[PDB]
A paper describes a structure:
[name] is a covalent inhibitor of MEK1/2, which are effectors of PDGFRA signaling (Goto et al., 2009). In [name], this cysteine residue is replaced by Ala353, preventing a comparable covalent interaction. Therefore, to obtain mechanistic insights into the inhibitory effect of [name] on [name], we solved the 1.5-Å structure of [name] in complex with its interacting partner [name] and [name] by X-ray crystallography. [name] occupies the ATP-binding pocket of [name] with a binding position similar to that in the equivalent MEK1 complex. Both MEK1 and [name] form common hydrogen bonds to [name] through the kinase hinge (for [name], at His286) and catalytic loop regions (for [name], at Lys340). The missing covalent linkage in [name] is compensated for by a van der Waals interaction involving Ala353 as well as two additional hydrogen bonds: one involving the threonine gatekeeper residue (Thr283) and the other involving the catalytic lysine (Lys235), which is displaced in MEK1 by its distinct αC-out, DFG-out conformation. Further structures of BMPR1B suggest that this kinase favors a more collapsed conformation of the ATP-binding pocket that would disfavor the binding of [name], potentially explaining the observed selectivity of [name] for [name] over other BMP receptors. [name] dose-dependently inhibited BMP pathway activation induced by ca-[name], whereas its effects on ca-BMPR1A and ca-BMPR1B were more modest. Taken together, these data suggest that [name] can inhibit hyperactive BMP signaling downstream of mutant [name].
In particular, approximately 80% of the HIST1H3BK27M tumors contain mutations in [name] (Buczkowicz et al., 2014, Fontebasso et al., 2014, Taylor et al., 2014a, Wu et al., 2014), which encodes a bone morphogenetic protein (BMP) type I receptor. DIPG-associated [name] mutations are known or predicted to confer gain of function (Buczkowicz et al., 2014, Fontebasso et al., 2014, Taylor et al., 2014a, Wu et al., 2014) by mechanisms that may include neomorphic ligand responsiveness (Hatsell et al., 2015, Hino et al., 2015) or ligand-independent activation (Mucha et al., 2018). Furthermore, we characterize [name] as a dual inhibitor of [name] and MEK1/2, and demonstrate its efficacy toward tumor cells in vivo.
Residue numbers in the entry:
A (entry chain A): 170 to 186, 192 to 272, 276 to 499
B (entry chain B): 0 to 108
The structure:
Amino acid sequence: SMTTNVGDSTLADLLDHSGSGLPFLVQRTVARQITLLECVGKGRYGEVWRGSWQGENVAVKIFSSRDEKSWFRETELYNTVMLRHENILGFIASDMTSSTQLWLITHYHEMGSLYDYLQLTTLDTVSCLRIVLSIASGLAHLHIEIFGTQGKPAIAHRDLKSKNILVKKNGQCCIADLGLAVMHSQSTNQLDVGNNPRVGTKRYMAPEVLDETIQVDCFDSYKRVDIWAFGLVLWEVARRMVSNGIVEDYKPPFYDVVPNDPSFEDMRKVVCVDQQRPNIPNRWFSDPTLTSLAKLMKECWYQNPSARLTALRIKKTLTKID
Amino acid sequence: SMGVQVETISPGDGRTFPKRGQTCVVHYTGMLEDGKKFDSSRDRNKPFKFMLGKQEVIRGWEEGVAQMSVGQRAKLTISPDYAYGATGHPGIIPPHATLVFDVELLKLE
Ligand SMILES: CCNc1cc(O)c2c(c1)/C=C/C[C@H](O)[C@H](O)C(=O)/C=C\[C@@H](C)[C@H](C)OC2=O
């Protein structure tokens, strides 16, 4: 560019080797050099904007005043844990300005959210398996503690859903939004649940969350809540894979029994009182891939959380499917 | 001065001070008040640039560098309201932190 000077770095160079993103002091300067361009998300959390920095695309989440504790938690996690993985959204920077604006800056994924993607296209066996395997890989990476200096605590997400998964250009996905995450280390048995009053998306809440039997001081319990939600995402995706010229329309989990923006009670009645689960379309049982995915979904949806499989076992199972 | 104490480690040219709109090229090491280093351009061997007056850096860092001449190295002790204030920067800078920066003003552009 005409404004380029010898010594200028790209974002990749600035990210090249404490914390997941840019060097701390570089975070404010880059944030305050971004030009906002297009709104790509809006919700109760605030807004997400495509922006540009030195000719590179970035995504900028601008938090609502009601969700400031998610900004705090997510910034704290990415700054204290080296969280770089192909299937976890790449953090770049966090910044605040004095009301106050709170920004979280991440990699920009032009293909958008999985929720929107499933409404814009159908899938085949290659693209379906790639999506669900990549989500399992990201989730297993979160859940597994890595020891040593280049390690990471175990992490449970607590708000996994298709809107919190982004599609990359290569057709794999990455898991986003760590504002509700909880951390655990076996070295100390310390559980870090944070201070965020936010709760998970109601439609995706596991039975033990809806009936308040979840053991809130047990890290394992939060992993099993993620597994339930992953099973729902697996169902959403599988519906959009064509087999024998047939495909289901995109629908969110429990579309047929709860309204939009369901209440706690709406979900508790469906999931806990009535013990309902998403229906498996009959056409899946004529397809070996969808038959395998249906078996996997069911193993995420046991009422007894101890019966559910691990993220790693899901990943291994999906790696063996063709 | 207000919000930032400047202790000279080695002198600049005594004549060339940053003006509004100039780009300051610096090396820095940032530490908490207990000596814990949290960031250093020296460790990655890559000078850091910011434009004076653009509020691209915390107020104390900017107003400290504004008092330095080219070539000067100085220790800047920055009060919290001239740094990251009551919020801090989650996971890095605690609330109400006084910061210590070792800064060298390499050149102006
Ligand atoms: C056309 C490209 N559309 C796009 C491209 C993107 O890169 C993003 C987003 C959209 C965000 C969408 C909102 C999303 O559904 C959810 O609410 C959420 O907040 C998930 C991720 C956040 C943390 C990051 C900042 O979002 C993106 O990175």
